């Protein structure tokens, strides 16, 4: 009756993390002195910040 595919509950782009998540990134990137590493690694740092998706299929009867 109302087509609103998304809920709108701060889900979709909002990265709710405690800044200790930085350790998670250091483990993936191996090196901890990331005061300077992110400046020479822009392309990888951006990829680590993008999403994954799940889809909700339904089929209806056509008339």
């Amino acid at each position: 009756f109302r087509d609103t595919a998304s809920i709108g509950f701060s889900d979709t782009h909002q990265d709710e993390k405690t800044l200790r998540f930085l350790k998670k990134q250091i483990s993936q990137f191996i090196k901890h002195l990331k005061e300077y590493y992110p400046n020479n690694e822009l392309t990888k740092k951006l990829v680590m910040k993008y999403s994954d998706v799940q889809l909700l299929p339904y089929t209806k009867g056509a008339t």
Binding site: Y36, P38, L42
Partner: protein, 435 residues
């Protein structure tokens, strides 16, 4: 110290410092073609005086012509406060001709509207210093006035007119010099005996280029993003009392238009865009027993008290359908110049823009009235029921009413500013489109 802020570096910085593109401590300046700028006086063709029309033809002293200032020498006939923008008041009509084709034309009231809208801050104060007596000078004071012209090529070098590229075309300005200038040769409608005639000269700065660029200007075809002013006057429908008059102005504008500006004025008193009232600075003698609301305290003609202005609301309609929903008059005096210019606008002068940066020259949005059959400006007037002589009523009432003296604002001036394309090739110029 500051190191502590460099240490506090985080993930949020990936968008701000990651793979730097610029730094703020290593600026590289672009090298520019060698040129020189010179101030040269043009000769006025005709007899200079009140009510006379004269012209000037541009001498091709250089490669491009850029900034034209018309100088007046005036003797005031009154004491301080009796004058209000007398230099541009005299400079009534300035017509720009390039090669036999009319290109633009500005009026004294446009110079005041432009000063009322687009010229701002200390630059507007300085403008007033160039056009008026601002230090309470008394009768007999002699002063040299400067009225810079504001044609498309006058404010930015990037639109300077390449005379070397126009060797086969005449560039001329025609000047209509007003017969009545307030505080100089008339006080209101009364002639000032012994008033001196004006002395005028036209100064312009020329641009001289080195060999390579002047050659490029002389031989290559060029296009310039020329701007033009469009204007025709009409009468107001200002009511007296118990009714808010409606008026529909059928507009005669065309070309991609940046903005529309208009004012309501008293054709007798240059720059009077508001009703006169017995409040400080709003009329001659205001606040004293000698106060009168038929004559302004001229030097303070411009005010910001919008309750003395007559526009209750305005709406622009295009081809039978509204362009925006009706706004009250204070919207066009206070919000549009705020959004677009970031200056001030005196009461009685109104601006609505189609452009986001009309003060700029690079296009920022236009309404092309060349493709619009019916452009109409709908006005609602305020009821002119307040007794102008009683400050308790002038300063103590509602938004839909104004002073009874507002009925003197019998003239309506709607200006439109738009884009065109100026073509220059093989020594001759002209417009790509004219409507």
């Amino acid at each position: 110290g500051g190191l502590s802020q460099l240490v506090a570096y985080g993930a949020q910085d990936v968008y701000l410092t990651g793979n730097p593109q610029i730094t703020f401590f290593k600026t590289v300046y672009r090298r520019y073609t060698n040129f020189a700028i010179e101030s040269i006086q043009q000769t006025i063709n005709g007899s200079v005086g009140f009510g006379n029309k004269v012209s000037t033809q541009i001498s091709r002293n250089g490669d491009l012509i850029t900034d034209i200032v018309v100088e007046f020498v005036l003797t005031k006939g009154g004491n301080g406060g009796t004058t209000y923008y007398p230099a541009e008041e005299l400079l009534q009509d300035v017509e720009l001709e390039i090669g036999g084709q009319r290109i633009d034309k500005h009026y004294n009231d446009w110079f005041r509207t432009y000063d009322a809208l687009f010229r701002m801050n200390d630059d507007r104060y300085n403008y007033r210093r160039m056009t008026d007596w601002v230090n309470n000078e008394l009768v007999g004071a002699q002063k040299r006035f400067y009225v810079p012209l504001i044609f498309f090529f006058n404010q930015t070098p990037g639109l300077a007119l390449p005379l070397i590229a126009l060797q086969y075309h005449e560039v001329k300005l025609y000047f209509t010099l007003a017969s009545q200038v307030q505080g100089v040769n008339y006080n209101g409608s009364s002639a000032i005996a012994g008033a001196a005639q004006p002395t005028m000269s036209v100064w312009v700065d020329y641009i001289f280029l080195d060999t390579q660029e002047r050659t490029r200007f002389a031989q290559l075809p060029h296009e310039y993003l020329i701007e033009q002013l469009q204007f025709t006057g009409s009468e107001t429908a200002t009511p007296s009392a118990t009714t808010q008059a409606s008026q529909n102005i059928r507009l005669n504008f065309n070309h991609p238009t940046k903005y529309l500006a208009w004012n309501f004025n008293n054709p007798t008193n240059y720059g009077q865009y508001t009703a006169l009232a017995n409040i400080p600075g709003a009329c001659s003698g205001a606040g004293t027993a000698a106060a009168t609301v038929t004559t302004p305290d001229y030097g303070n003609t411009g005010t910001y008290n919008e309750q003395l202005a007559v526009l209750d609301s305005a709406k622009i309609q295009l081809n039978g359908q509204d362009r925006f929903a009706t706004r009250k008059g204070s919207y066009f005096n206070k919000v549009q110049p705020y959004q677009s210019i970031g200056g001030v606008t005196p009461a009685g002068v109104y601006l609505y823009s189609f452009a986001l940066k009309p003060a700029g020259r690079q296009p920022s949005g236009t309404c092309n009235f060349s493709r619009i059959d019916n452009a109409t400006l709908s006005l609602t007037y305020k009821t002119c029921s307040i007794d102008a002589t009683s400050p308790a009523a002038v300063l103590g009432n509602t938004e839909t009413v104004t002073a009874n003296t507002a009925t003197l604002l019998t003239a309506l001036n709607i200006y439109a500013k738009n884009y065109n394309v100026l073509r220059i090739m093989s020594g001759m110029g002209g417009l790509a489109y004219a409507n």
